[PDB]
Amino acid sequence: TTTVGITLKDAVIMATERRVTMENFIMHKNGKKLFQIDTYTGMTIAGLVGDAQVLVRYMKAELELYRLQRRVNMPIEAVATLLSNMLNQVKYMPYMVQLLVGGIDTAPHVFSIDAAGGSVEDIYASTGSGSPFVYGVLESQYSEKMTVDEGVDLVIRAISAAKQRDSASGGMIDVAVITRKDGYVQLPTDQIESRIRKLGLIL
Amino acid sequence: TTTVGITLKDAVIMATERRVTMENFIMHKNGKKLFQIDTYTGMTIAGLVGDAQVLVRYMKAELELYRLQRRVNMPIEAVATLLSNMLNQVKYMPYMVQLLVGGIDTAPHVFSIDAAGGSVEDIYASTGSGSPFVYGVLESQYSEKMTVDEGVDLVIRAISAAKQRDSASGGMIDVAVITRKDGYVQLPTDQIESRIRKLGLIL
Amino acid sequence: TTTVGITLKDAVIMATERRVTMENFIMHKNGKKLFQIDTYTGMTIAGLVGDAQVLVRYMKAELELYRLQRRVNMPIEAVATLLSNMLNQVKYMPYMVQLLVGGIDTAPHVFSIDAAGGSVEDIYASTGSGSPFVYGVLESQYSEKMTVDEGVDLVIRAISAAKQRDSASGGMIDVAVITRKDGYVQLPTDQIESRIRKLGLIL
Amino acid sequence: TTTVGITLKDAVIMATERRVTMENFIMHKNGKKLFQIDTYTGMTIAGLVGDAQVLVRYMKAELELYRLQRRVNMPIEAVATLLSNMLNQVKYMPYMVQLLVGGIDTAPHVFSIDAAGGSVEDIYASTGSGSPFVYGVLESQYSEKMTVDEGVDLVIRAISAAKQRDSASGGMIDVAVITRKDGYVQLPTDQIESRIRKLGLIL
Amino acid sequence: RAITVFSPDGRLFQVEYAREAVKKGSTALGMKFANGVLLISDKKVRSRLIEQNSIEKIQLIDDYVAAVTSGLVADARVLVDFARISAQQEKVTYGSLVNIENLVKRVADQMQQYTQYGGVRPYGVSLIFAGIDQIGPRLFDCDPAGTINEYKATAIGSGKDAVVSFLEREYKENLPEKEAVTLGIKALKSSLEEGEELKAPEIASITVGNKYRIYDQEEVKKFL
Amino acid sequence: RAITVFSPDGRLFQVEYAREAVKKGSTALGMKFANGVLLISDKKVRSRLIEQNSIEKIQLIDDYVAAVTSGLVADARVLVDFARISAQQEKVTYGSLVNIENLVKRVADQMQQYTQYGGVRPYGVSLIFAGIDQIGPRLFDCDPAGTINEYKATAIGSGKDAVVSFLEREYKENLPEKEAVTLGIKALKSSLEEGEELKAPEIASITVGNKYRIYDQEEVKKFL
Amino acid sequence: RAITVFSPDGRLFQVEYAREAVKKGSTALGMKFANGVLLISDKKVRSRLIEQNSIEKIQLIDDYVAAVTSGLVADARVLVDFARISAQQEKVTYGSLVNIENLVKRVADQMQQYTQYGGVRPYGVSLIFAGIDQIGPRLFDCDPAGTINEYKATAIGSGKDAVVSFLEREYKENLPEKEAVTLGIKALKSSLEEGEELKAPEIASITVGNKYRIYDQEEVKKFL
Amino acid sequence: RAITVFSPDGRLFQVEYAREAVKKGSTALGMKFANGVLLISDKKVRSRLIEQNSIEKIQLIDDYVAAVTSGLVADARVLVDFARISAQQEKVTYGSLVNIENLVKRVADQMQQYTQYGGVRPYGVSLIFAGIDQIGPRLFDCDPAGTINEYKATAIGSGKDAVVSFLEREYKENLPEKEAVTLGIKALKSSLEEGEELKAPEIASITVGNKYRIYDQEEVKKFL
Amino acid sequence: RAITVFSPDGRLFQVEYAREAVKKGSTALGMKFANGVLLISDKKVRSRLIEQNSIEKIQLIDDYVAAVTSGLVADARVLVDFARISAQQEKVTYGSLVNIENLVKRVADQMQQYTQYGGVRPYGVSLIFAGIDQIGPRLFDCDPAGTINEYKATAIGSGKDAVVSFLEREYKENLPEKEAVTLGIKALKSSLEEGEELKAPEIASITVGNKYRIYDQEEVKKFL
């Protein structure tokens, strides 16, 4: 696994490779790791399958409940903070999970929550076994003056890079851009393949 | 991590470097470790991310509650003592956290609380992985006859020193001076960079 | 750490060096280890910071409560016995603390309580990492025919000796004499420094 | 530690050396290990300080309560049996204590209770680290045709022997004879020293 | 006084007295349309210092199920919150809320307990749940004893009887959304138009294949 | 005697009797202004040995939310403390108190329980919460049954009716802070000026973007 | 009989009846001086076999806070002991007792519970706490319902009304210690001098910057 | 019937009725002497098949403290046993029983609870504790409400009033042991000599620096 | 109805009514002899289909202690079983049953609780325990309130009074076993011989230094 969240202007994009493993032996050539968790926030998984799903089902339900009672979406810093508290409380039968949650509430954000409930916001962040690789290319080519299109393309480059040098990562990249204007929208497979070919990451 | 608290006259200053790590692999080039915890006391973190945040959220809420019920700010020796008791009670599923809390209630103070709830007040203290380094320079150049300006500059020197010799520390220094007269005020980034350049710790 | 309690006539004196460590790396050059715990009894700490403080806060409150309900100070053998019982009951998540408590109720006493709640009274006793050293000099030069002045001076000699040969001990000695006549009175720093110089333990 | 109980005629004598250790490093040159536990029974301690005291405070109170409710002293075999049951019930967070209890209820007895609550009565028994040594001399020179005077002197010989060959034992021997006729009476130091000199165990 | 224990004529008077309490509430009603269900409530607004819109009596339980309540306001709140969390429980267990029937039963059971046990009065509130599940549009009713009945249209509160008769005569099963809310408002009118006023009701609808849409002030007055 | 169990006419008399108890309290009132909300209470001061200022009936729950209470003083204290800790709980869970509506509901639920269960009388106190959250200025009311209503202005205690009518006629929704407290004090006057005295009320205000400011003795008398 | 449940006129008769019980106690009073506070109690001594001094009705809670009690003696003891341990709890948590206000509230809450719950009568005792904290001299009163009021001078027991009126007229806020105890004893006199006797009261004072000093037999008679 | 709840005149009738029950017991009394305290009880012996000496009503709590009881025999036993174990608890915690005052308070608290709570009648027994502690000779009394008073001499049971008056007139504070028991027996005589008989009382004394000595049959008759 | 709570005349009527219930039982009695104690009971046998011997009313608690009971049969069984296990507890703790006094007290405490607490009627049975312990022969009695008295001879049940008077006159303290059982049977006769029949009693004896011996049918008739 490798996931990536890039914050820019008034959007955040989050992309994951889709590939579970589950022995070494790669058993699923199409898992799910990027999940919408609220109408204005999505969350990416990069740890251990089981555990990671449970945090997702939890989170879907918990933000949904909130939204209903208060009639408003939960802030990013709030869902973050909440998730930290959840993880930290049972950190001695711990989840071995590395969670990244980005969303746009009043400005974009991308928080990285480790397995022990430490959440620190940064302007980009990756998680997972191909983590270092996307951090390489991002650290060379990220600029906060990027628009969504350039955004998605920087994402695609980075994740393709990760796949090449890390054998745990792999499998068809999927990206979602979450903006205030269009809501959370996950880009369809056809849009992504076109972008690969163009950037010349195709083989 | 490295944090520093310096008590002088009728002020205390506290500064931290901003940089989380979180693998080794430095994943955040701008974390938060110095936190205001009350209108007249701030607290610096230098242990393990998750745990350390939880002590902070706790402490914000607990001093806030106190202040409301008694209509007065909690003394430093009191928040200290309280924090010790909290840590000591669950010292067998322990927080691995090294906390420094300074503030001004009637005189300045700076208490160092270890992971097991031992709190001893000293006239200066550091915590964290670059701990020894700032202790070096402080032990040579600290005088209790210093004013705030000299204070902030001694702080800056010390933390810059730490960064150089410790690869876990690093990242843009932020300082807050807490005085009785202006309250707790955290110095803006622009003020700090100017001070680096001047002291000739710039490169 | 090293602490010393010397019983003589109708007084007991207790002195400690002031120095916490807390890595190895000596982090506090002025801790507190001798604590008044009742108007006619004081108690010296020589184990592990955190734990040791908690026994102190406990003990302050517990003798204070007693005194109020019964309208009389608790006997030394009683505070001793009580402290033993406290330690012994949670001796499988044990305090690693070596406590010495002396006071004067009807005659002077000095009880040594180990980590497991064994309390045995002796006419002198030390605790801590420089324990052997003061035991050396005391075992040569203690006489129970000593007056307070000679008392304090025997104490000072002994603790100075400990500092020299033990690198965990160190830092400005503080002594308290507890008598029936003047109550518990802790000798001011100025009085002690004068006594060092005189005894020619100054450098 | 070493303690000794000798049953003879219509008396039992019990003696201990007085010396705690408590590091190795002998920290108390006068502990207490022989304790009266009822008007017609005393009990000797030879294990670990803390634990051992707690069994004593317990036992004092428990026989005292009994005596009050039933208006009669508890039998030896009963206090024995009771003590076994106490130890055996929490034998997985066990006391590491070796207890000997003798007393005279209708005939003399001396029961040896190990750490796991096994109590077996014998006509003499020792406990502690100098255990073997007194067992040597007793096994040569014990006769059940002895009177108290010969009794005390056999005890003294044996314990002096133990001290010589075992460096954990040591320190001024104290003996108590418990008879039906005079009750429990503990022999004063002056009586004992005289007996050493005479037997020519003096140096 | 009295408790839930059976009277000599086989009735739980505390429950009966509960039912009286729902009758003293504010009217609200609902009915299914062609492809959805609607909930439309009277608004207990009379003071001008009350915050209009903010007081919602059609409350959502989940994006695709709402409930509008009648009775003691306080007990309605708590019970509404019971339902919300119970919905969430199914989402976390099963993955989805596949039957609104279930959701309404669980909540029903809760009320049935407080109607069984002493040391506790019954829950004195009535509610109707509507939403679309895998089965399709569902309209359910819930009573103080825990009783549940499945409707095509139903009413609650003060205009319970009134609205019931209106609906009993003039309800057509497949009706387009528009005509439907109109029918609602006519039924609510006849009833509540005994003070010779009605003001603006609060109106919500859901259609198959989407989420609940709560209307706005301006819309409602057009169907008014 | 009586307990919360439903009477034959669908009423919880213990709750009714609770409500009587709040009516026998001291008057206090509040209303929103242009960009904030204010709380202003009558001061139950008559003895000169009472410590004036020290007895505060507008109590803070959190820096940005206050509540002023009416009813039995004792129950008000405890319930006020319930609210404080509940606020703190949200701060430790979520990071912030994003809705005062929530805060007031939780406290409401507490009261609703003691109104449900036997072995326990209802909580006989009324309170209004005001503060600014992410949504904006909010004024809420809380009743012995647990009932909550959202206001623009509302009153409580002895001058409940009195103050209500005053406000019902003369309240203008966007009013500057100054004019607003004046309106308050006029409304509080009409009412409480039946002993032909009023003395100095205790006054607090909050404005968006800042914390609660509790006024001082000297200020209030200027608006007096 | 009766229980804490609200009467038809909004009163908790059990609490009312509690208050009657405190009225049947022994008088005690207190007031602040220039830099401290004093507590002075009547001594319920009439038998000569009673151990005079040994029966103390001014009891210390902590070195720097005392409380003198009135009401049922038995309940006063227990509640006094509740307070002692609660003080100690703050010492072990926080390091110090920084507000006597807090100390008195916690104890108040305890009484408020026994006034809320059934299966338990209220605590029928009254007490006043005095001491100096970080804020300064404080005099507090505590009632059977849990009610707390902050005073400059206050009274309790049989001479409650009597002593109250005396103090209401003749109390001067900053008075030196000496003149102050005299004023006390005069107020206690007027009242309790209806049997035409008073004997010697038990007197305690604290001043800022020190501990409580409980006077001796011989001293008191000089101010007598 | 009735329970501990306050009557309209501020009294706990169950406690009052408790006190009646102690009055219907057997008389016992005690008083301090020069250097000790004595307890002397009437013996409820009338049958010749009763085992005389074996029935002891002066029971030891600890070697240096005894208590003699009056009231319902059964409740006295249990409460006496409560006291014994409580003494033992202090021995195991602290090392010694340094204050008999404490010992008597703890036991008092126990009785005060059963006087607070419902679902439980009060403990209907009275007792006096005597013994010597670090403070010196102490004589304490304990009542059904939990009340404790410290004496020089006190009485209990049927001859409560009778014995009280005797002692009220003729008690001299420092009296030698001998003269003291005589005074006791004279006081017990006046009272209990209304059947024109007294038989032999059971007598115990303690002196400072030693343990309780319970007298024998033959001794007592000499002071008789 | 009624519960254990004190009546206005200081009596626990439920206990009184308990005592009535024991009076309606079958008579049984016991007394000490030279070196042992005996228990001899009337046999509630009237039907011929009842299994004679099999119904034992003298039941052993331990080899060296028996108890014969009177009252409600059912409660007697359970309480008898309480005693058996309690004896066994002492055997497993201490090694032996060194005092029968203790054994009888523990069982007494049990009864005293059900006489203290509500939600539970008293145990309506009486029993006498006899046996030899380290102290020697002991005969004890136990009452519904938990009361215990130590005898030389005592009775229970219907012939309580009757048998009591017989024993009161004609009991000689040291009597040989033989003469003793005869005296018993004479006392049991006078009483129970009011139907002009007695049949064969069930008889048990213990002597110091041995175990309980329960007699056989044939033996008893010889002393008959």
What is the domain-level CATH number for residue A69?
A: 3.60.20.10
Q: Are C84 and C118 in contact (CB under 8 A)?
A: yes
Residue E75's closest CA among A52, F122, H76?
Answer: F122
Best to test chain C binding among H91, H94, H96, H101 (most C CBs inside 10 Å): H94
Three-state SS at F219: helix
Among the listed residues C86, C80, C88, C98, the one whose alpha carbon sits nearest the alpha carbon of residue C38? C80
Active-site choice (B1, B41, B44, B127): B1
I69-I71-I73-I78 Cα dihedral, nearest 10 degrees:
-70
CA distance B118 to chain G (A): 14
Name the CA radius of gyration of chain D, rounded. Answer: 16
Q: Which of F74, F81, F114 sits opposite G145 (nearest CB)?
A: F74
DSSP assignment of H148-215, as one string?
Answer: EEEESEEEESTTHHHHHHHHHHH--SS--HHHHHHHHHHHHHHHHTTTT-----EEEEEETTS--EE-
From the list A69, A72, A78, which residue is nearest F94 (CB)?
A78
| CB-CB contact of G29 with G156 (8 Å) | yes
How long a stretch of residues is chain B? 203
Q: Running DSSP on this structure, what letter comes out for residue H217?
A: H
Residues 6+ apart with CB under 8 A from A202: A196
Disruptive mutation site among B2, B3, B85, B88 for chain C (greatest number of C CBs within 10 Å): B88
C-alpha C168/C-alpha C129 separation (Å) is: 7
Q: In what order do the strands lie in the sheet with F28-32?
A: F153-156, F28-32, F36-41, F202-207, F213-214
**CB of I206 within 8 A of CB of I212?**
yes
The minimum CA-CA distance between F19 and chain G, rounded to whole Å, is: 8
Touching pair H, G by Cβ (3+ pairs < 8 Å): yes
Sign of the torsion angle spanned by Cα atoms H192, H193, H199, H204: positive
Q: Provide the 8-state DSSP code for E151.
A: E
**Chains B and E make contact, 3+ CB pairs within 8 Å:** no
- Going by the DSSP 8-state scheme, the letter that residue I37 receives in this structure is E
Q: Best mutation site among G89, G90, G92, G94 for testing chain B: the one with the most B CBs within 10 Å?
A: G94
Give E111→chain A minimum CA distance, Å. 22
Q: What are phi and psi of D55, to 5 degrees?
A: -65, -35
Instruction: Identify from E88, E94, E214 which residue to disrupt to test chain A contact, counting A C-beta atoms within 10 A and taking the largest count.
Output: E88
CA angle A85, B81, G63 (to 5 degrees): 135
Residue C95 phi, psi (nearest 5): -75, 140
Q: Is G202 on the interface with C (CB under 8 A)?
A: no
Overall resolution, Å: 3.3
Half-sphere exposure of D100 (CA within 13 A, CB side): 28
Could you say which residues from 75 to 104 on chain E have a Cβ atom under 8 Å away from some Cβ of chain A? 81, 84-85, 88-89, 91-92, 95
**CB–CB contact A62 E88 (8 Å):** yes
Query: Amino acid letter at F21?
Result: A
Contact of E23 with E157, CB cutoff 8 Å: yes
Subunit partners of chain G (3 or more CB pairs within 8 A): B, C, F, H
Helix (H) or strand (E) holding H62: strand H58-62
What is the token pair recorded at C4?
Answer: 């010393």
Element (H, E) at B161: helix B148-165
| A48, B28, D137, G149, H64 from H133: Cα distances, Å | 68, 68, 46, 41, 8
End-to-end, the C-alpha distance of chain C in Å comes to: 21
For residue G104, the SS3 value is: helix
Chain H hits for C72, Cβ within 8 Å: 98-99, 134-135
Q: Chain C residues with CB-CB distance to G under 8 A?
A: 57-58, 60-62, 64-65, 68-69
Determine the structural domain holding residue A25 and report its residue range. Answer: 1-203
Q: How far is CA F65 from the centre of its chain?
A: 11
A70 burial via Cβ count (<10 Å: 0-12, 13-18, 19+) = middle
Which residues are CB-neighbours of H222 under 8 A, at least 6 positions away? none
User: Which has the closest alpha carbon to A83: A122, A48, A64, A56?
Assistant: A56
- Asked if D49 and C118 come within 8 Å (Cβ–Cβ), the reply is yes
Q: What residues of D are in contact with residue H95 (Cβ under 8 Å)? A: 57
- Judge whether F23 and F35 are in contact, CB under 8 Å: no
- Neighboring chain H residues of I104 at a CB cutoff of 8 Å: none
Residue pair G107/G86 in contact (Cβ under 8 Å)? The answer is yes
Contact residues, chain C to chain B, C-beta under 8 Å: 20, 22-23, 25, 27-32, 48-54, 57, 93
Sheet containing B2-8: order of strands: B124-128, B2-8, B11-16, B174-179, B184-186
H-state helical runs in G2-152: 13-23, 73-94, 100-116
Is F88 within 8 Å of B58 when comparing Cβ atoms? no
Question: What are the residues whose beta carbons fall under 8 Å from the beta carbon of B188, sequence distance 6 or more?
Answer: none
* Residue H128 to residue H208: CA distance in whole angstroms: 18
Candidates H193, H166, H84; CA nearest to H129 is H84
Q: Which residues of A are catalytic?
A: 1
Task: Please enumerate residues of D whose Cβ is less than 8 A from a Cβ of C.
Answer: 20, 22-23, 25, 27-32, 48-54, 57, 93
Both tokens of I145, joined, read 């309130």
Do I10 and H2 lie within an 8 Å CB cutoff?
Answer: no
| Residues pairing with B186 in the sheet | B176
CA distance linking residue A162 with residue A158, whole number of Å = 6
CB G10 within 8 A of CB F124: yes
- CA C4, CA F174: separation in Å to the nearest integer? 74
Angle ∠(D61,D66,D69) on CA atoms, nearest 5: 125
Q: Does H147 touch chain C (CB under 8 A)?
A: no
In C, minimum Cα distance to G83 occurs at: C65
**Closest alpha carbon to A115 in A89, A95, A134:** A95
C62, B150 contact by CB (below 8 A): no
Rounded to the nearest angstrom, the gap between the alpha carbon of residue F223 and the centroid of all alpha carbons in its chain is 21
Contacts 24+ apart (CB under 8 A), F54-60: F54/G150, F55/G149, F55/G150, F56/F202, F56/F214, F57/F26, F57/F28, F57/F202, F58/F28, F58/F202, F58/F203, F58/F204, F58/F214, F60/B68, F60/F212, F60/F214
B25 contacts in A (CB within 8 Å)?
131-132
SS3 for chain C, per residue?
A: CEEEEEEECCEEEEEECCCECCCCCCCECCCCCEEEEECCEEEEECCCHHHHHHHHHHHHHHHHHHHHHHCCCCCHHHHHHHHHHHHHHCCCCCCCCCEEEEEECCCEEEEEECCCCCEEECCEEEEECCHHHHHHHHHHHCCCCCCHHHHHHHHHHHHHHHHHHCCCCCCCCEEEEEECCCCEEECCHHHHHHHHHHHCCCC
Method used to solve the structure:
cryo-EM
**Which residues of C are known catalytic residues?**
1
The Cα–Cα gap between A4 and A27 comes to 22
| CA C41 – CA C46 distance, rounded (Å) | 17
Would the CB atoms of H78 and I112 count as touching at under 8 Å?
yes
| Pairwise CB contact (< 8 Å): B132 & C30 | no
Test I93 with D85 for CB contact under 8 angstroms.
Answer: yes
- Residue-wise over F104-135: b if at least 16 C-beta within 10 A, else e? bbbbbebbbebbbebebbbbbbbbbbbbbbee
Sequence-ordered list of residues with C-beta below 8 angstroms from that of C69, at least 6 positions apart, any chain = G81, G84, H99, H102, H105
What DSSP line would sit under A109-172, residue for residue? EEEEE-TT--EEE-SEEEEETTHHHHHHHHHHH--TT--HHHHHHHHHHHHHHHHHH-SS--S-
Tell me which residue of F85, E60, F130, F89 sits closest to A66, measured CA to CA. Answer: E60
Taking the CA of residue C97 and the nearest CA in chain D, the distance in Å comes to 13
Is C47:C115 a contact under the CB 8 Å cutoff? yes
Gap between the Cα atoms of A152 and A187, Å rounded = 10
Cα gap F201→F223, rounded to integer Å: 10
- Structurally, chain B folds into a number of domains equal to 1
How many CB atoms are located within 10 Å of the residue G95 CB?
20
C56 Cβ partners below 8 Å, 6+ apart? C35, C37, C43, C45
Query: Which residues form the domain of H173?
Result: 1-224
Do the Cβ atoms of D84 and D112 come closer than 8 Å? no
d(CA H99, CA H111): 20
Measure the CA–CA gap between B174 and B169, rounded to whole angstroms.
13
H54 interfacial to chain D (CB closer than 8 Å): no
Is beta strand D108-113 parallel, antiparallel or unpaired with respect to D99-104? antiparallel
Q: How far apart are CA C133 and CA I4, in angstroms?
A: 71
The answer to whether B27 touches A113, Cβ cutoff 8 Å, is no
Interface residues of chain F, partner chain E, Cβ below 8 Å:
2-12, 105, 108-109, 112, 115-119, 143, 145-154, 167-168, 171
CA distance H135 to E113: 61
Kindly report the CATH number assigned to the domain that includes residue F131.
3.60.20.10
G17 close to G145: Cβ distance less than 8 angstroms = no
Torsion of CA I86, I87, I90, I92, to 10 degrees: -100
β-sheet bridge partners, residue D45: D99
Contacts of B68 in chain F (CB under 8 A): 60-62, 84
- Tell me the C-alpha to C-alpha distance, in Å, between residue F134 and each of B57, D78, F66: 20, 74, 16
Q: C-chain residues within 8 Å CB-CB of G61? A: 68
D13: nearest Cα among D201, D200, D195: D195
Out of G48, G49, G121, the one facing H6 most closely (by C-beta) is G121
Across the interface, do E95 and A61 touch by the CB < 8 Å criterion? no
- Within 10 Å of residue F9's Cβ, how many Cβ atoms? 10
Closest-CA distance, G109 to chain F, in angstroms, reads: 7
Task: State the Cα torsion I105-I110-I112-I114 to the nearest 10°.
Answer: -170
C-alpha of E58 from chain center: 8
**E20 touches F11 (CB < 8 A):** no
CA A197/CA F117 separation, integer angstroms: 68
Count other Cβ atoms within 10 Å, centred on residue C110: 23
Taking each helix axis as running N to C, give the angle between helix I73-94 and helix D76-89, from 0 to 180 degrees, rounded to the nearest 10.
Answer: 90
In contact, D147 and D9? CB cutoff 8 Å: yes
CB-closest option in C70, C77, C81 to H99: C70
Total domains in chain H come to 1
**I to H contact (≥3 Cβ pairs closer than 8 Å):** yes
In chain A, residues with a C-beta closer than 8 Å to the C-beta of F98 are: 70, 72, 74-75, 78
**Tokens of residue E105, six digits:** 């039963």
Flag if B78 and G96 touch (Cβ within 8 Å): yes
F74 closest CB neighbour out of G11, G147, G153: G147
Distances C192 to C134, C157, C182, C189, F131 between C-alpha atoms, Å: 18, 11, 18, 5, 59
Q: Which of D69, D72, D78 sits opposite I94 (nearest CB)?
A: D78
What residues of A are in the E interface, CB distance below 8 Å? Answer: 57-58, 60-62, 64-65, 68-69
Cα–Cα distance, B120 to H58 (Å, whole number)? 56
